[PDB]
């Protein structure tokens, strides 16, 4: 309904360790459910290491919808979020 536009953002531009952790996890759970791998599986088996390689190449097709207390939010795409860690 309401929502925020991507030119009025204000949240920390880096990836929250909880976001990184739930994205590496989320993709791992999805990758382990035989979901398409968008990265170049270079001799990989573990579905987490694939997701870590997917998050290292930022080829993860996920958007983090960061909910602010007022109810409204502002999505950030995994590929646009910096990954300082």
């Amino acid at each position: 309904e309401k929502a925020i536009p991507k030119d009025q953002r204000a949240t920390t531009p880096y990836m929250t360790k909880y976001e990184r952790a739930r994205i590496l996890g989320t993709r791992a759970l999805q990758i382990s459910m035989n979901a398409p791998v968008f990265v170049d599986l270079e001799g990989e088996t573990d579905p987490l290491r694939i997701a870590m390689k997917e998050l290292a190449e930022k080829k993860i097709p996920l958007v983090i919808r960061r909910y602010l207390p007022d109810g409204s939010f502002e999505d950030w795409s995994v590929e646009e979020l910096i990954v300082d860690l």
Binding site: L68, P69, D70, S72
Partner: protein, 105 residues
């Protein structure tokens, strides 16, 4: 404002003028200004255009703001009213200056 020496008749008689805030303070607590004490920080009144600003800039609901008692020894000193906000500047050991805000419940 009136300064009752030792007592005041409850002849209640105060809240009685619509376009007037009828304030009352005693001479005993006014002997030493409390706002001069080590632990009492700067309390600043907020204009109705400042409150309506801080509430939208922090995306707040009025209830969600930290509250300052109506009869707070400082809320009276500044003659606060219901709904007035007061930015509070305290010297913190992590940022040096930390802005807090309280609404007068």
């Amino acid at each position: 404002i009136f300064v009752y020496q030792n007592n005041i008749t409850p002849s209640k008689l105060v809240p009685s003028i619509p376009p007037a805030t009828i304030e009352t303070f005693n001479e005993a607590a006014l002997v030493v200004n409390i706002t001069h004490h080590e632990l009492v920080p700067k309390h600043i009144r907020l204009s109705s255009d400042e409150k309506r600003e801080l509430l939208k800039r922090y995306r707040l609901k009025e209830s969600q703001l930290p509250r300052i008692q109506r009869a707070d020894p400082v809320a009276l000193y500044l003659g606060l009213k219901r709904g007035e906000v007061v930015k509070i500047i305290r010297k913190s050991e992590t940022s040096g200056r930390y802005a807090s805000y309280r609404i007068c419940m």
